[PDB]
Every structure is written in structure tokens, then in C-alpha cells.
Amino acid sequence: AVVASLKPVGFIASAIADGVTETEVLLPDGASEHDYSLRPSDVKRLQNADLVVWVGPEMEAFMQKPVSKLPGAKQVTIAQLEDVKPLLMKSGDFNMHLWLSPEIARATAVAIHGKLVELMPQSRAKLDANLKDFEAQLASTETQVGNELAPLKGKGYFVFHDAYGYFEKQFGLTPLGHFTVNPEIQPGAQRLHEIRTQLVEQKATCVFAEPQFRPAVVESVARGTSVRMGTLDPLGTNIKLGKTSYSEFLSQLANQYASCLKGD
Ligand SMILES: [Zn+2]
Ligand SMILES: [Zn+2]
Incomplete structure (x- = not known):
């Protein structure tokens, strides 16, 4: 194999x-x-x-x-x-x-x-x-x-961890930033405050969780704002291996972005 x-x-x-x-x-x-x-x-x-x-x-x-x-x-x-x-x-x-x-x-x-x-x-x-x-x-x-x-180019959002840059650069997506670099080191309040200030001030559309991590800090950040919540999966867990699986993966990730970011 x-x-x-x-x-x-x-x-x-x-x-x-x-x-x-x-x-x-x-x-x-x-x-x-x-x-x-x-x-x-x-x-x-x-x-x-x-x-x-x-x-x-x-x-x-x-x-x-x-x-x-x-x-x-x-x-x-x-x-x-x-x-x-x-x-x-x-x-x-x-x-x-x-x-x-x-x-x-x-x-x-x-x-x-x-x-x-x-x-x-x-x-x-x-x-x-x-x-x-x-x-x-x-x-x-x-x-x-x-x-x-x-249509989504120019909309700000935050992702959970810094995993998406190659995809975002390729397709013109404009992230405001990420919660964590390493998604195991939970982000402090510092910090969670900086993210939510950015959210409001820069008028962000979305914050994104990831299925590999509990979404609590993402939900906490979005709380009391108009920011929508979504989920991105950089590991394509629900896609089965097979001939067209890489294409399916890229399309699913794009749909995950658009699902939240749509509706301007
Ligand atoms: Zn990663
Ligand atoms: Zn960083």
C-alpha cells in the first residue's frame, strides 16, 4: 500500500x-x-x-x-x-x-x-x-x-488555527486572522478580547471552528455580536479515500467557507 x-x-x-x-x-x-x-x-x-x-x-x-x-x-x-x-x-x-x-x-x-x-x-x-x-x-x-x-473575497473572518493560508491565497480569501497557531495551546482571554474587538471594529462576517477541537472559545468570541459561526475541516474527515477525493475535499472546504460567509 x-x-x-x-x-x-x-x-x-x-x-x-x-x-x-x-x-x-x-x-x-x-x-x-x-x-x-x-x-x-x-x-x-x-x-x-x-x-x-x-x-x-x-x-x-x-x-x-x-x-x-x-x-x-x-x-x-x-x-x-x-x-x-x-x-x-x-x-x-x-x-x-x-x-x-x-x-x-x-x-x-x-x-x-x-x-x-x-x-x-x-x-x-x-x-x-x-x-x-x-x-x-x-x-x-x-x-x-x-x-x-x-463573491466572498474581501470579507473578514477568523479561523481556529493557522491551517488555510495556501488555499486562501490561491482563491483570494481575506482572513483577519486565527485564534491559535497551535490549536492545543488554548488562547487566553487577552487575546480572545483582541479577536472580538477586531470582529466588531473591522466588521467581520464569520468565525470558524474545527471538528478536531471543542468550539467553546469560538462560540464565546461570537457571543453578543452579529458574527456568524461556521466550521472548517482542514483534514477532510467525512470524505472517503478514492480517485476523486482530493477534488471533493477542496470543494467541501470551499462550501464550508461559503456556507458561513454567504449573505452579505
Ligand atoms: Zn494544523
Ligand atoms: Zn499568527
Whole structure:
């Protein structure tokens, strides 16, 4: 199987590996990329993987050690790809939520395709078709999402944690900011006051929770204002792995933004 660290990384892999091999995901639905430790079984999957796909040591730190033991030919380290490095944004150091950038997802698919052709020469024609089919579906999805989000450009909102910058930059969304950088370090009152002052003063439309975290501080901030409440899921928990799952993921996230931000 191809073993992907996070579900959306899995979505990209499953486009390319479709009809070739299985895709498995390490991080369970509900879990956070910022607060996880590998299970004994997670470890076994890694050693036995045909290919491991992950963002890199500044993202899934919980995977760095077991991945370091594998052949270079059996891993894609997304953040370290030559075509990805020029695309990194500071938004230290650089923001590592790379699976929300279509352009990086493209570079990821190319790397996956390239590695799997070497490892599985029996599936070269299928892998080639899968890559073509992935690019076509992604290009259509980018057109669709760009349209869905266009009216929303310029509306301020806050997100729970700093996960969305690549997507927001791509499609012209204009976040006022985020509650947390690391979503485990709960934000203090300081702070929650600064956010609500921004909300009112800058006339924000939305605040967004995330299903991986209890929404209390988000609801608290919105309380006594006209700001609407929504939810974004940077990990696509309700989407199943499969050929068109990455496109479905981007479309779902866009719909989650629009659901709250619509109605000017
Ligand atoms: Zn994150
Ligand atoms: Zn910040």
C-alpha cells in the first residue's frame, strides 16, 4: 500500500494509486496533525509500505524517525520537493499545511507517480492515466472553487488555527486572522478580547471552528455580536479515500467557507 500521514495527503495519493495499490492513512479521523503519537500498529504499516507520503519534519514530527529509516525511493517528503520549495509561504518558519495548495498537490502527484512507476513498472500505463485524470479533475475543481469563492473575497473572518493560508491565497480569501497557531495551546482571554474587538471594529462576517477541537472559545468570541459561526475541516474527515477525493475535499472546504460567509 501507499501509506500517507494525513487524510488529505491520502486523497492525493489515492488519485494516483487508484487501480494500482491501496492507500492507507496514519492519522485517524478526529485526530490533529499537531498532537499525535504513532501507535505500535502505525509503525508496522510504515515499515511495510510500498511508499510513504508525508509533508515533512516541520509538520508530522511524530513520523520523522521511522520515515528516516526507509529508502529515499520509498518516500515522498512533500516539503522537501524541489518543485515545492519555491512555493513555500512564510504567511521559524514556513507554513507547512501544504495539502491545501493545488500547485503543491500537483507537485505531490507528480512525485508519487514518479516513485510508483519505478517501484511498480507493471502499472505504468494506469499510473500515467491516473496522473492525467488527476490534473483534469483538479483544474476543473480550481475553476469551480474560484467561482464559488469570488463573491466572498474581501470579507473578514477568523479561523481556529493557522491551517488555510495556501488555499486562501490561491482563491483570494481575506482572513483577519486565527485564534491559535497551535490549536492545543488554548488562547487566553487577552487575546480572545483582541479577536472580538477586531470582529466588531473591522466588521467581520464569520468565525470558524474545527471538528478536531471543542468550539467553546469560538462560540464565546461570537457571543453578543452579529458574527456568524461556521466550521472548517482542514483534514477532510467525512470524505472517503478514492480517485476523486482530493477534488471533493477542496470543494467541501470551499462550501464550508461559503456556507458561513454567504449573505452579505
Ligand atoms: Zn494544523
Ligand atoms: Zn499568527
